[PDB]
């Protein structure tokens, strides 16, 4: 599988559509009653572009998302009556909007949600099964969220695949140092963390699920910046004194603001970063090399596919998607 999430940053091109097996439009959100927000114009355009260019492509709607209040999912899913009506609305929405499935993006289920989340996904799949609509969900990357909220065997028993979000390992909340948004591995002896890497997150999933073919390893087409960054903490320039958080930058916008010839490729972590000694700017990101190393890992581990957040962040020449694709 090559599962591409899509945010409406720019049109979906005919070339992109052919490189995916699944296109996940993001997002629709439910209200407190379980009514889904209408599909936006930019997302509807991508549905049409995708199906026109690739008649095998499955176009799905992601429901929820990182900005969406998880207490609304709690409310809808915990009451058997509202669960039923929410599910019926989801299935009606797929029909009305000519969609092939849906992704539940609940950020994040708590310990009180763990069992009802599984019931919701099981009951949703039952309602979707006659039409063959594809069901997926997005899963977290650290034990902090995974252990309380995610019964991975129960989830697996309901869904067609699990989109594992192996990114956002460092970010605006980080107080200790710079670090990689999405490395493949722990970065050697200077790395202060054993777990903030894609390999740890995927291994956690591999030890819990029955069939690893049901997993997709998520990869980001964006990176993150800090400014006023200082010296390495322990001899390795990936982890540097802070500094002020910048923002999340799509790949397509990085090279206009950073000199990409200064890229450092961390050979142990398999991650790309730039520290600019003239400006003290820092950029952690994924590039063609990091994605090639990640695709190789997915194949080596027998993981069922690669998920991308998000394909519209790629440049006009599809540097990132072609690296995953080729």
Ligand X SMILES: CC(=O)N[C@@H]1[C@@H](O)[C@H](O[C@@H]2O[C@H](CO)[C@@H](O[C@@H]3O[C@H](CO)[C@@H](O[C@@H]4O[C@H](CO)[C@@H](O[C@@H]5O[C@H](CO)[C@@H](O)[C@H](O)[C@H]5NC(C)=O)[C@H](O)[C@H]4NC(C)=O)[C@H](O)[C@H]3NC(C)=O)[C@H](O)[C@H]2NC(C)=O)[C@@H](CO)O[C@H]1O
Ligand Y SMILES: *[C@@H]1O[C@H](CO)[C@@H](O[C@@H]2O[C@H](CO)[C@@H](O)[C@H](O)[C@H]2NC(C)=O)[C@H](O)[C@H]1NC(C)=O
- The reply on whether position 102 binds ligand X by CB under 6 A is no
- The reply on whether position 203 binds ligand Y by CB under 6 A is yes
- The answer to whether residues 219 and 308 touch, using CB atoms and an 8 Å cutoff, is yes
Torsions phi, psi for 167 (to 5 deg): -165, 180
Residues between 250 and 309 that touch ligand X (CB under 6 A): 309
DSSP assignment of 209-238: -S-GGGEEEEEESEEEEEES---BSSS-TT
Closest CB to ligand X among residues 65, 305: 65
What is the per-residue binding string for ligand Y in 219-248, x denoting contact by CB under 6 A? ------------------------------
At 181, list the tokens.
């948004």
The interface region with ligand X, picked from 86-94, 118-126, 140-148, 315-323 by CB under 6 A, is 140-148
Q: CB neighbours of 125 closer than 8 A, spacing ≥ 6?
A: 135, 158, 159
- Exactly one of 10, 125, 186, 212 binds ligand Y (CB under 6 A); that residue is 186
Residues, the chain: 326
- The reply on whether position 185 binds ligand Y by CB under 6 A is yes
Q: CB neighbours of 11 closer than 8 A, spacing ≥ 6?
A: 45, 46, 49
At 146, list the tokens.
């995974």
At 178, list the tokens.
């710079």
- The reply on whether position 169 binds ligand X by CB under 6 A is yes
- Exactly one of 138, 158, 274, 324 binds ligand X (CB under 6 A); that residue is 138
Rounded to a whole number of angstroms, the minimum distance from the CB of residue 159 to ligand Y is 24
Rounded to a whole number of angstroms, the minimum distance from the CB of residue 185 to ligand Y is 4
**What residues make contact with ligand X under the rule CB under 6 A?**
5, 62, 65-67, 105, 107, 138, 140-142, 144-145, 165, 168-169, 171, 173, 222, 248, 309-310
């Amino acid at each position: 599988r090559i599962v591409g999430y899509y945010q409406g940053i720019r049109p979906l091109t005919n070339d992109q559509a052919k490189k995916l097996t699944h296109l996940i439009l993001a997002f629709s959100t439910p209200d407190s009653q379980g009514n889904l927000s209408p599909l936006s114009s930019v997302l509807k355009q991508a549905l049409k572009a995708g199906k026109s260019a690739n008649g095998a492509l499955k176009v799905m709607i992601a429901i929820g998302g990182g900005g969406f209040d998880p207490a609304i999912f709690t409310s809808l899913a915990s009451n058997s009556g509202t669960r039923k009506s929410f599910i019926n609305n989801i299935v009606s929405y797929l029909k009305t909007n000519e969609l092939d499935g849906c992704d539940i993006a609940w950020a994040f289920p708590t310990s009180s949600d763990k069992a009802i989340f599984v019931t919701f996904l099981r009951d949703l799949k039952k309602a979707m099964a006659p039409s063959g609509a594809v069901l997926s969900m997005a899963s977290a990357a650290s034990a902090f969220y995974l252990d309380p909220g995610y019964d991975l065997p129960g989830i697996e028993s309901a869904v067609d695949f699990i989109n594992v979000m192996c990114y956002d390992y460092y970010g605006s909340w980080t107080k200790t140092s710079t670090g990689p948004n999405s490395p493949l591995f722990k970065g050697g002896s200077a790395d202060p963390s054993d777990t903030l890497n894609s390999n740890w997150t995927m291994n956690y999933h591999l030890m819990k699920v029955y069939n690893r073919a049901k997993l997709n390893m998520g990869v980001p087409f964006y990176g993150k910046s800090w400014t006023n960054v200082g010296a390495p903490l322990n001899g390795d320039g990936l982890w540097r004194q802070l500094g002020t958080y910048g923002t999340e930058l799509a790949w397509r916008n990085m090279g206009k603001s950073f000199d990409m010839t200064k890229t450092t490729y961390h050979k142990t972590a398999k991650t790309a970063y730039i520290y600019d000694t003239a400006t003290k700017n820092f950029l952690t990101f994924d590039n063609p090399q990091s994605l090639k190393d990640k695709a190789k890992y997915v194949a080596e581990k027998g993981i069922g596919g690669i998920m991308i957040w998000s394909i519209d962040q790629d440049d006009d020449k599809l540097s990132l998607l072609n690296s995953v694709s080729y």
